[PDB]
Design an enzyme around this catalytic site. Structure first.
Site, mmCIF file in Angstrom:
data_model
loop_
_atom_site.group_PDB
_atom_site.id
_atom_site.type_symbol
_atom_site.label_atom_id
_atom_site.label_comp_id
_atom_site.label_asym_id
_atom_site.label_seq_id
_atom_site.Cartn_x
_atom_site.Cartn_y
_atom_site.Cartn_z
ATOM 1 N N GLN A 1 54.916 30.234 -17.204
ATOM 2 C CA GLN A 1 53.792 30.744 -17.980
ATOM 3 C C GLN A 1 53.811 30.179 -19.392
ATOM 4 O O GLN A 1 52.775 29.760 -19.921
ATOM 5 C CB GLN A 1 53.841 32.275 -17.981
ATOM 6 C CG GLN A 1 52.603 32.998 -18.497
ATOM 7 C CD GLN A 1 52.604 33.197 -19.995
ATOM 8 O OE1 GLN A 1 51.642 32.855 -20.677
ATOM 9 N NE2 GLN A 1 53.688 33.762 -20.515
ATOM 10 N N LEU B 1 54.299 32.849 -10.523
ATOM 11 C CA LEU B 1 55.045 32.076 -11.502
ATOM 12 C C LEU B 1 55.760 33.031 -12.441
ATOM 13 O O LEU B 1 55.301 34.149 -12.690
ATOM 14 C CB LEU B 1 54.153 31.119 -12.306
ATOM 15 C CG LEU B 1 53.265 31.632 -13.442
ATOM 16 C CD1 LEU B 1 52.879 30.483 -14.345
ATOM 17 C CD2 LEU B 1 52.015 32.272 -12.904
ATOM 18 N N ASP B 2 56.895 32.579 -12.958
ATOM 19 C CA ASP B 2 57.750 33.411 -13.787
ATOM 20 C C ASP B 2 57.293 33.342 -15.241
ATOM 21 O O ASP B 2 56.201 32.861 -15.554
ATOM 22 C CB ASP B 2 59.208 32.985 -13.643
ATOM 23 C CG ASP B 2 59.755 33.258 -12.264
ATOM 24 O OD1 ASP B 2 59.251 34.186 -11.600
ATOM 25 O OD2 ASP B 2 60.696 32.550 -11.847
ATOM 26 N N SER B 3 58.135 33.850 -16.141
ATOM 27 C CA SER B 3 57.857 33.763 -17.569
ATOM 28 C C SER B 3 57.900 32.320 -18.051
ATOM 29 O O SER B 3 57.077 31.906 -18.882
ATOM 30 C CB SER B 3 58.874 34.609 -18.336
ATOM 31 O OG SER B 3 60.184 34.086 -18.173
ATOM 32 N N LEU B 4 58.832 31.539 -17.502
ATOM 33 C CA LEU B 4 59.110 30.201 -18.003
ATOM 34 C C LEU B 4 57.947 29.258 -17.716
ATOM 35 O O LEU B 4 57.496 28.524 -18.606
ATOM 36 C CB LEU B 4 60.415 29.713 -17.367
ATOM 37 C CG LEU B 4 61.270 28.589 -17.956
ATOM 38 C CD1 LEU B 4 60.751 27.190 -17.649
ATOM 39 C CD2 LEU B 4 61.412 28.799 -19.455
#
Lengths: 87, 128, 459, 96, 165, 119, 65, 176, 73
Positions: A46, A41-44
């Site tokens: 998260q 999963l990416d930053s967004l």
């Protein structure tokens, strides 16, 4: 006006609400695991995890602190710091 | 899609649309780093003179004492009588005073004439 | 009354021929016996005023102020230790004897026969207090504070002497009944205007009025606690008593000449209530509060109504007790932290918890607590000034609102909301502090039960 | 972003100290405090009733100009309990 | 009004203390059948708002608006009270809907606990005082004025009409 | 009603106006029309301290209503027939005042328009 | 023992609190029915509000013209 | 304006705008499922232009995003009853005595609570013993004369505590 | 200390509002929700709570019988 809490219980609750989420597998979900590296999963997403657990536990964490969680162990530690979980 | 949020003496400009945080100069980032260095040194010496168990009393802030002596004792020096100071002094010292003066003489003369004739409410007017 | 004068003389060498750790007990015990002696005084009845001696006399307006002075003395001598207790015994005896001599001149001042004697005891009221505040001002501009003090009061009070010699040499003797019983309406010349302006101007300095007000707050922020409480209470309400005495003369021209004093009084009351809402240095807030209340007193004196006089003397006694209390509150926080600032020292909701009720009641009495003597006095003042003018109520009510606001802000600034978590030295509440508090606020509310004493000569 | 590992290590030391501190705050001496050493209604609303009924006869009526009463209304078809005389009632009603 | 909002505020504070002192209308939606005592209390309060015909809240407000209508009326304030009557109907309905009626949204590990003798005693006794005492008090007063009692069409019906719409 | 719409939009002429109500003098179209019964005993009306703005017509119904309310007080739901009688009598008086308004309206309209069409 | 909390589930309800709640709502409705049926009829004004009072010419008196 | 750095890492500014827009849409939208719809639509709108490799185009879209956000904001965001400006904001602050105190009690009450006061004494031993050399030498040795940060290093040397621990560890429970 | 935490793979969402919004969002072309987090907010002892007018219908689902008994009294 006295909710009891425990470290293993709140660890299992945070693990449970992580396991509820879609795109990570419920099979391989560690207590001690990265977020950007291994779970896919990416930053967004998260920060969406951050937002949902803020909404469930009833107290926000700031974006000046949202840079640096990266793993559920520190999440349980920081929420335990907010709640001061001993008898 | 908006009138672009005019600023004013009450309209506090929020830190989202500055818009000076768009064309950031490298020297402005250097100024931000110097600001971080100033706050770093000051909080460092605060935690030096603050966590000492050997220490007993207050923190002895020099800046608050600086502000208080600037606010109280550093008024009369420095000063020069300029045009703006003298004009604003005449406006706040004499103006409303002579305003209340003339309205008190006016209402008093109305009362004086109306009791000089005798057509007052003195049917019973005991507690003077 | 000389039976009240001479034991105060006898208490003067008591501190000298008291040994170590015995000055305190002797002075406090015997001054409280003087307090019983002071409460014995009220024999006064009805029409005339009582005469005590070939020399002097007690009016019904002199008696509560004498009670206030001899009641404020033991409270004050109880107050002014522990900030000079580390210094020498000989200097401590000097300080105690200087306070007792100061009291003796104050009693001679309040119980005066003639206004010449009142003038002698007026500047005798002045002089040793300046020695006290200059020797123990404990702040670097006490020099300039005392210099301003003596120059303003002696400069304003100078033509009073010449006017009194003129009243002597054109109207016979100066004793209050034969000064009374003989007066004539003196017409609209200029000499009446200048003599009236001289006497009233001397007392304008003594209140103070607004245009000569800065005399007062430096002499409060740069004074120790004894000189400050004596200064505010006894000196300013002594000036008010002096004007209340002398104002029997020159009534036909004061209607023509008394307008701008009322004007500066009211508008400076407004501006002074405005200035003590924003300031830090909490000690100054009591001083500008006193300027506001004595400007209200002055409005009440230059209107010449019995309602006004009774309300004015009630406001005098109530604000004297209130300002001495609030000075003691400021000294309590100053013993806790050596700051004198306002925004620094905060918290104290947890720490020293019952002191908060005393700070509450102090802001209540400066807030005009609704059965307090302060509210009753200000109420009669507002009633009398609205009878004098049907238009004056804007400034009175704005004084009321802003007075409430700065008294409340004075409450909630230093003792509301959050400990600053760097004080970390202060001790809990002493016995002496709340002892002085109980000495302040019990007689105030017990006068608020039965205020039959504390109204004017036309009770 | 994220922690530097020195902050992680420092974080672990102060989490250990915080948990030990709150462990100490959990008190159990098993005797923590230790010292050296209708009748309600009867007293509370029969003593002041006695005092107020005692005061509200004698002192309050020896002060003459005192507690006073808008009279209960007398009606034209009734009788007086004190003196006693009948009042004339109202006359014929009709066309209701 | 005193009985009315005493009972209403105390029911609201019961719910807020029951729900972790969160105080808000966001994340509050559907809480009916979570114990029906406080929900019944709140809906009887909000039905007593504007006086559903004809209850303890009926008498005061409706005789006031009709007595204002049948007099030398200043022609704008009556319109103000009419529009404000419609408005207090609509926000009483909105506080009902966003309090108890939508979907349940609240954090888990609930302390939703009204198994409490004190609060059921207090709310019980105030609903008893909120359903009888309006008629009882309004009946036994000396008539100190003239009741109107003579109204045209849509001048007595107008309060009920506006609250229903 | 339409009285207010006509009075504020058309003419206020033929519609009479409050606080200036008696416009025509009496006995113009009365003939022999006054009874004003009023045997309600003015002195005993003083003796029974009614509220002011109630020392009026239909007062005897209020007297009997207060009489039965007094002399049987804890019978909480006793006096209702006399209560309705008093309400009905004030209904009579209210209809009579509306009759006064509309009588002045009809008189003013008819006679003023007749004489100001042909005079 | 008294209640203990749960996790994400619909909370349980004793029969007593629900029977008091429905009892109080139904007795509200009972009072408003017996108040609404047996005696009033407080919706209508207990009086026929008249027309323009009579619509009678020269009863109440108008002159012939 | 931040503890660690001076700049604030533009990605993080985008993330801040993400969190604030999502919170204001929480405040905007009740019923939670139309909210989920609107949040996924906003998330898709952000993912329409995720992989733009420019920076001036990115900050232009950021400026236009700030304009559309400040136009379409909400007056009262649903801030939590622990958040600053919220419902509580230290509601039960009333019992927050910092524990530099409690040594100024009378020794009768200190005889009443013996265990906690002896253990406070051994924490005081632990405070004093590690205070001078290790703490002052790590503060005076590893930083430069410009300290340049706000974070403190752990005492990774051999033994005892990293510095400044006293007020950080010994702060109250935040719910008395 | 147990709480026993009623676990996952139990909801399997199926519910009407989330089902309709998943189908609408799929026809829109996204197909990326949060997940099944609203299921314990939607069903269980939930799922057909009563509407607005039914809360006022709650008043007379028991009082008519006692009212007609009191009328017969």
């Amino acid at each position: 006006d006295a909710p009891p809490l425990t470290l293993e219980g709140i660890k299992d609750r945070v693990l449970y609400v992580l396991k509820l989420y879609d795109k990570i597998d419920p099979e391989k979900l560690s207590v001690n695991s990265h977020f950007m590296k291994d779970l896919g999963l990416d930053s967004l997403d998260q920060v969406e995890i951050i937002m949902a657990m803020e909404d469930e536990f009833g107290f926000e964490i700031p974006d000046i602190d949202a840079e640096k969680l990266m793993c559920p162990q520190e999440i349980v530690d920081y929420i335990a710091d907010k709640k001061d979980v001993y008898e | 899609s908006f009138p672009k949020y005019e600023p004013s003496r009450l309209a506090s400009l929020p830190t989202t649309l500055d818009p000076a945080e768009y064309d950031i100069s490298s020297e402005t980032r250097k100024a931000q780093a110097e600001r971080l260095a100033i706050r770093s040194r000051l909080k460092r010496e605060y935690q030096l003179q603050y966590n000492d168990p050997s220490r007993r009393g207050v923190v002895e802030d020099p800046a608050l004492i600086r502000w208080t002596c600037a606010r109280s004792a550093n008024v009369y020096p420095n000063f020069r009588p300029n045009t703006k100071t003298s004009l604003l002094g005449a406006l706040f010292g004499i103006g409303p005073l002579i305003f209340w003066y003339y309205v008190f003489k006016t209402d008093r003369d109305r009362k004086e004439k109306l009791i000089q004739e005798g057509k007052l409410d003195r049917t019973f007017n005991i507690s003077y | 009354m000389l039976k009240y004068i001479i034991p105060t003389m006898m208490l003067m060498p008591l501190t000298w021929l008291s040994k170590n750790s015995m000055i305190w007990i002797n002075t406090t015990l015997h001054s409280l016996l003087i307090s019983l002696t002071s409460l014995l005084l009220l024999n006064q009845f009805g029409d005339n005023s009582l005469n005590f001696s070939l020399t002097f006399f007690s009016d019904s307006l002199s008696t509560p102020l004498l009670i206030l002075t001899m009641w404020l003395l033991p409270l004050m001598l109880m107050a002014s230790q522990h900030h000079l207790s580390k210094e020498n015994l000989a200097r401590k005896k000097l300080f105690i004897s200087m306070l007792i001599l100061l009291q003796l001149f104050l009693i001679m001042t309040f119980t005066a026969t003639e206004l010449i004697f009142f003038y002698i005891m007026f500047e005798a009221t002045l002089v040793p207090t300046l020695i006290i505040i200059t020797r123990w001002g404990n702040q670097t501009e006490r020099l300039n504070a005392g210099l301003y003090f003596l120059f303003y009061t002696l400069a304003g009070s100078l033509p009073l002497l010449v006017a009194l010699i003129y009243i002597q040499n054109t109207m016979g003797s100066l004793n209050f009944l034969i000064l009374q019983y003989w007066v004539q309406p003196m017409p609209n010349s200029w000499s009446n205007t200048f003599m009236w302006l001289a006497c009233m101007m001397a007392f304008m300095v003594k209140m103070p009025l607004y245009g000569l007000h800065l005399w007062l707050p430096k002499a409060h922020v740069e004074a120790p606690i004894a000189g400050s409480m004596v200064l505010a209470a006894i000196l300013l309400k002594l000036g008010g008593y002096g004007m209340m005495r002398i104002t029997l003369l020159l009534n036909p021209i004061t209607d023509f000449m008394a307008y701008p004093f009322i004007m500066l009084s009211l508008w400076g009351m407004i501006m002074t209530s405005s200035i003590c809402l924003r300031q830090t240095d909490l000690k100054s807030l009591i001083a500008y509060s006193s300027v506001s209340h004595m400007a209200l007193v002055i409005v009440a004196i230059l209107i010449q109504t019995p309602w006004s006089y009774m309300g004015a003397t009630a406001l005098m006694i109530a604000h004297g007790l209130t300002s001495s209390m609030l000075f003691c509150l400021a000294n309590s926080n100053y013993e806790r932290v050596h700051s004198r600032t306002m925004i620094l020292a905060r918290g104290l909701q947890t720490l020293l918890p019952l002191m908060a009720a005393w700070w509450l009641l102090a802001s209540l009495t400066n807030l005009a607590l609704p059965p307090s003597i302060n509210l009753i006095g200000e109420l009669f003042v507002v009633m009398s000034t609205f009878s004098w003018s049907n238009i004056t109520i804007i400034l009175m009510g704005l004084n009321m609102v802003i007075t409430a606001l700065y008294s409340l802000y004075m409450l909630i600034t230093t003792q509301r909301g959050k400990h600053t978590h760097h004080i970390n030295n202060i001790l809990p509440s002493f016995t002496r502090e709340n002892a002085l508090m109980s000495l302040h606020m019990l007689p105030l509310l017990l006068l608020s039960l039965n205020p039959k004493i504390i109204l004017g000569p036309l009770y | 972003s994220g922690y530097t590992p020195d902050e992680k290590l420092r974080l672990q030391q102060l989490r250990e100290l915080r948990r030990r501190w709150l462990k100490d705050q959990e008190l159990s001496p098993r005797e923590p405090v230790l010292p050296p050493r209708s009748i309600f209604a009867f007293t509370h609303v029969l003593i002041p009733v006695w005092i107020i009924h005692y005061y509200l006869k004698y002192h309050v009526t020896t002060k003459p100009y005192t507690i006073v009463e808008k009279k209960p209304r007398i009606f034209p078809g009734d009788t007086i309990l004190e003196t006693g005389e009948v009042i004339p009632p109202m006359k014929e009603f009709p066309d209701q | 009004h005193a009985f009315f909002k005493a009972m209403l505020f105390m029911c609201s504070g019961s719910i807020i203390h029951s729900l972790n002192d969160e105080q808000d209308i966001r994340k509050m939606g559907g809480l009916f059948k979570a114990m029906p005592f406080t929900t019944t209390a709140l809906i009887i309060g909000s039905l007593a708002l504007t006086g559903m015909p004809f209850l303890t809240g009926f008498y005061s407000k409706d005789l006031i608006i009709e007595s204002a209508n049948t007099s030398y009326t200043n022609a704008w304030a009556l319109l103000m009270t009419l529009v404000a009557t419609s408005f207090t109907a609509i926000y009483s309905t909105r506080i009902i809907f966003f309090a108890l009626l939508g979907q349940p949204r609240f954090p888990t590990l609930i302390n939703i606990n009204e198994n409490n003798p004190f609060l059921i005693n207090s709310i019980k006794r105030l609903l008893i005082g909120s359903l009888f005492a309006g008629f009882i008090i309004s009946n036994n007063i000396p008539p100190m004025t003239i009741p109107q009692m003579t109204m045209p069409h849509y001048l007595k019906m107008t309060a009920l009409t506006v609250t229903i719409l | 009603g339409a009285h207010l719409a006509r009075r504020y939009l058309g003419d206020a002429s033929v519609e009479p106006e409050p606080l200036r109500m008696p416009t025509f003098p009496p006995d113009y179209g009365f003939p022999e029309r006054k009874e004003r019964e009023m045997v309600a005993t003015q002195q005993e009306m003083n003796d029974a301290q009614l509220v002011l703005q109630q020392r009026d017509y239909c007062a005897h119904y209020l007297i009997r209503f207060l009489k039965c309310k007094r002399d049987s007080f804890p019978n909480f739901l006793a006096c209702k027939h006399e209560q309705h009688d008093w309400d009905y009598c004030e209904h009579l008086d209210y209809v009579k005042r509306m009759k006064e308004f509309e009588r002045e309206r009809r008189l003013l309209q008819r006679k003023k328009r007749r004489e100001q069409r042909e005079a | 023992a008294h209640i203990e909390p749960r996790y994400r589930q619909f909370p349980q309800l004793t029969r007593s609190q629900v029977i008091q709640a429905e009892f109080f709502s139904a007795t509200m409705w009972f009072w408003i029915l017996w108040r609404f049926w047996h005696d009033s009829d407080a919706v209508l004004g207990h009086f026929p509000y008249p027309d323009p009072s009579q619509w009678t010419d020269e009863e109440l008196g108008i002159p012939p013209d | 304006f931040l503890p660690s750095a001076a700049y604030l890492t533009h990605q993080q500014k985008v993330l801040q705008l993400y969190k604030r827009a999502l919170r204001h849409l929480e405040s905007r939208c009740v019923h939670r499922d139309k909210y989920r719809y609107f949040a996924c639509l906003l998330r898709a709108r952000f993912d329409e232009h995720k992989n733009e490799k420019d920076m001036v185009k990115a900050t232009q879209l950021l400026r236009e995003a700030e304009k559309e956000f400040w136009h379409g904001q909400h007056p009262q965001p649903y801030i939590f009853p622990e958040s600053p400006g919220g419902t509580s904001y230290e509601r039960y602050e009333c019992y927050k005595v910092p524990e530099w105190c409690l040594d100024d009690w009378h020794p009768s009450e200190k005889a009443m609570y013996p265990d906690y006061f002896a253990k406070r004494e051994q924490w005081k031993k632990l405070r004093r013993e590690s205070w001078e050399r290790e703490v002052k030498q790590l503060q005076e040795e590893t930083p430069v004369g410009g300290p340049r940060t706000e974070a403190l290093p752990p005492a990774r040397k051999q033994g005892d505590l990293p510095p400044l621990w006293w007020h950080i560890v010994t702060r109250p429970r935040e719910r008395p | 200390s147990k709480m026993e935490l009623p676990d996952y793979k139990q909801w399997k969402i199926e519910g009407t509002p989330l089902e309709t919004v998943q189908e609408k969002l799929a026809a829109r072309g996204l197909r990326d929700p949060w997940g099944r987090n609203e299921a314990w907010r939607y069903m269980g002892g939930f799922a057909n709570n009563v509407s607005f007018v039914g809360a006022l219908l709650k008043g007379f689902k028991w009082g008519f019988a006692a009212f007609v008994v009191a009328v017969g009294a």
